[PDB]
Write an enzyme that holds these catalytic residues in place. Structure first.
Site, mmCIF file in Angstrom:
data_model
loop_
_atom_site.group_PDB
_atom_site.id
_atom_site.type_symbol
_atom_site.label_atom_id
_atom_site.label_comp_id
_atom_site.label_asym_id
_atom_site.label_seq_id
_atom_site.Cartn_x
_atom_site.Cartn_y
_atom_site.Cartn_z
ATOM 1 N N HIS A 162 0.845 -1.195 0.000
ATOM 2 C CA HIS A 162 0.000 0.000 0.000
ATOM 3 C C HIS A 162 0.880 1.245 0.000
ATOM 4 O O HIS A 162 0.539 2.268 -0.591
ATOM 5 C CB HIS A 162 -0.912 0.007 1.229
ATOM 6 C CG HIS A 162 -1.804 -1.192 1.325
ATOM 7 N ND1 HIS A 162 -1.649 -2.163 2.292
ATOM 8 C CD2 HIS A 162 -2.855 -1.584 0.565
ATOM 9 C CE1 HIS A 162 -2.566 -3.099 2.124
ATOM 10 N NE2 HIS A 162 -3.310 -2.772 1.083
ATOM 11 N N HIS A 183 5.435 6.804 7.049
ATOM 12 C CA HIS A 183 5.206 6.404 5.669
ATOM 13 C C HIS A 183 4.669 7.616 4.937
ATOM 14 O O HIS A 183 4.431 8.659 5.543
ATOM 15 C CB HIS A 183 4.173 5.280 5.589
ATOM 16 C CG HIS A 183 2.839 5.661 6.146
ATOM 17 N ND1 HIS A 183 2.543 5.566 7.489
ATOM 18 C CD2 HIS A 183 1.759 6.224 5.558
ATOM 19 C CE1 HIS A 183 1.337 6.062 7.706
ATOM 20 N NE2 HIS A 183 0.842 6.469 6.550
ATOM 21 N N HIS A 212 2.098 9.110 1.399
ATOM 22 C CA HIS A 212 0.985 8.920 0.474
ATOM 23 C C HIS A 212 1.379 9.879 -0.641
ATOM 24 O O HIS A 212 1.776 11.007 -0.361
ATOM 25 C CB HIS A 212 -0.333 9.373 1.092
ATOM 26 C CG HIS A 212 -0.753 8.559 2.274
ATOM 27 N ND1 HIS A 212 -1.539 7.430 2.163
ATOM 28 C CD2 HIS A 212 -0.468 8.693 3.588
ATOM 29 C CE1 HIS A 212 -1.718 6.906 3.362
ATOM 30 N NE2 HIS A 212 -1.078 7.653 4.243
ATOM 31 N N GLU A 229 -3.382 13.511 1.432
ATOM 32 C CA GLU A 229 -4.676 13.063 1.925
ATOM 33 C C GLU A 229 -5.434 14.265 2.468
ATOM 34 O O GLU A 229 -6.564 14.530 2.063
ATOM 35 C CB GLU A 229 -4.472 11.980 2.983
ATOM 36 C CG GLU A 229 -3.784 10.754 2.397
ATOM 37 C CD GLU A 229 -4.090 9.490 3.154
ATOM 38 O OE1 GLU A 229 -3.771 9.425 4.358
ATOM 39 O OE2 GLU A 229 -4.651 8.561 2.533
ATOM 40 N N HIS A 237 3.441 10.865 7.081
ATOM 41 C CA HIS A 237 2.735 10.556 8.317
ATOM 42 C C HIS A 237 3.664 9.872 9.309
ATOM 43 O O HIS A 237 4.156 8.770 9.056
ATOM 44 C CB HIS A 237 1.545 9.636 8.038
ATOM 45 C CG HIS A 237 0.410 10.309 7.330
ATOM 46 N ND1 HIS A 237 -0.597 9.606 6.705
ATOM 47 C CD2 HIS A 237 0.106 11.617 7.176
ATOM 48 C CE1 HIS A 237 -1.473 10.453 6.197
ATOM 49 N NE2 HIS A 237 -1.070 11.681 6.470
ATOM 50 N N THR A 267 -6.388 6.552 8.023
ATOM 51 C CA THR A 267 -6.870 6.831 6.670
ATOM 52 C C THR A 267 -6.910 5.589 5.776
ATOM 53 O O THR A 267 -7.242 5.678 4.591
ATOM 54 C CB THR A 267 -6.023 7.915 5.972
ATOM 55 O OG1 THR A 267 -4.695 7.422 5.756
ATOM 56 C CG2 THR A 267 -5.971 9.181 6.821
ATOM 57 N N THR A 268 -6.554 4.437 6.338
ATOM 58 C CA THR A 268 -6.600 3.180 5.595
ATOM 59 C C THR A 268 -7.352 2.170 6.441
ATOM 60 O O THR A 268 -7.417 2.298 7.663
ATOM 61 C CB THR A 268 -5.204 2.575 5.344
ATOM 62 O OG1 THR A 268 -4.645 2.136 6.590
ATOM 63 C CG2 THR A 268 -4.281 3.586 4.696
HETATM 64 ZN ZN LIG Z 1 -0.875 7.560 6.312
#
Ligand SMILES: [Zn+2]
Length: 257
Positions: free
Chosen positions: A61, A91, A93, A103, A116, A195-196
């Protein structure tokens, strides 16, 4: 399972994770002219001096840089937080183009990527217990814009070729996360969620006002990663971001005017 494609993306998550349509979902759009300055908010305290990085992993992901959180080596305190939160991993995005990838959005503006830094409340003993609490996690979000290179990010960029596919990992010791922060610690904060999936509503979000700049070459290397595992048809790891969700009955606070 879940992903960011047309058939398993954000629009589909609610079927297996009904909380996706919950009371405090993330990310959200930060309307700067609606956020309220809170003079009672203590200064943010980022203590990463003794941070001990261990490994970097492609989880299909995104990629996670994991830290040793067996002790209070790297913690986040102050601001809207009560107590001590330990850094466990960080990590990003990002998008397929520089015009998207983050995000959270600011006045609807999308950044090229979002960093994040995940921390869990030590009062709960372990990460697994913390995610089951309304104040279990604190995630420090930092926007990335494309411009000059970020020296402190290069070490991360250099190792991406060794974890191109899902399930791959590499040793990543002695990495200093302080090199990923902007000069200012001004921030916006609100109660949200992961958020996941599982999208648990256990996060106190702290989003920094000032973005960090990364070079085009650096983000291009992020986009060379794969969602797929080794041997499988290549699916470039891009646009692994969840779009903004309804703010609903929540207030975003600002640490500055
Ligand atoms: Zn994140």
């Amino acid at each position: 399972h879940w992903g960011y494609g047309k058939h398993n993306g954000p629009e589909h998550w609610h079927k297996d994770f009904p909380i996706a349509k919950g009371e405090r979902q993330s990310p959200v759009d930060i309307d700067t002219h609606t956020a309220k300055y809170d003079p009672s908010l203590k200064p943010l305290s980022v203590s990463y001096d003794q941070a001990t990085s261990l490994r970097i992993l492609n989880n299909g992901h995104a990629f996670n840089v994991e830290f040793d959180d067996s002790q209070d080596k790297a913690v986040l305190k102050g601001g809207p937080l009560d107590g001590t939160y330990r850094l466990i991993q960080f990590h990003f995005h990002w998008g397929s183009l520089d015009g998207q990838g983050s995000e959270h959005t600011v006045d609807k503006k999308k950044y090229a990527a979002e960093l994040h830094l995940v921390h869990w409340n030590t009062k709960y003993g372990d990460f697994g217990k913390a995610v089951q609490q309304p104040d279990g996690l604190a995630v420090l979000g930092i926007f990335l814009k494309v411009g000059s290179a970020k020296p402190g990010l290069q070490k991360v960029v250099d190792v991406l070729d060794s974890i191109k596919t899902k399930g791959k990992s590499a040793d990543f010791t002695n990495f200093d996360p302080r090199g990923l922060l902007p000069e200012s610690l001004d921030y916006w904060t609100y109660p949200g969620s992961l958020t996941t999936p599982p999208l648990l509503e256990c996060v106190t979000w702290i989003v920094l006002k000032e973005p960090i700049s990364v070079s085009s070459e650096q983000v291009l290397k992020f986009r060379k990663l794969n969602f797929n595992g080794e041997g499988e048809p290549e699916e470039l790891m891009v646009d692994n971001w969840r779009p903004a969700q309804p703010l609903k009955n929540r207030q975003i606070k600002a640490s500055f005017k």
